DNA sequence: CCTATATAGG
DNA sequence: CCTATATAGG
């Protein structure tokens, strides 16, 4: 399925987009929650590296609660 | 380095 | 109030 990398704490961190709560943007920065194992995680990447689902989540979350 | 940015989180 | 993220440089 369909994957997010993103750094956390200096290492590089991967989460199923299914487990992605809620996504935001911050200029160029995506940032977002998940569900991780229970508790929420959280992550961001640039938006040049956000995989295609990442973007329409966001621009579900923000073009679609105007 | 720092401050700011959006957001969530007992 | 604090922290964590990418980027700006206000």
């Given at each position: 399925m369909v994957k997010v990398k993103f750094?956390?704490?200096?290492?590089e961190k991967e989460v199923?987009?299914?487990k992605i709560k809620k996504?935001?943007?911050v200029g160029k920065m995506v940032s977002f929650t998940?569900?991780?194992?229970?508790?929420?995680?959280?992550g961001?990447?640039?938006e040049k590296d956000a995989p295609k689902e990442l973007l329409d989540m966001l621009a579900?979350?923000?073009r679609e609660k105007k």
């Open positions: 750094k956390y704490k200096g290492e199923d987009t299914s996504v935001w943007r998940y569900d991780d194992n229970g508790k929420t995680g959280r961001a990447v640039s579900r979350a923000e």
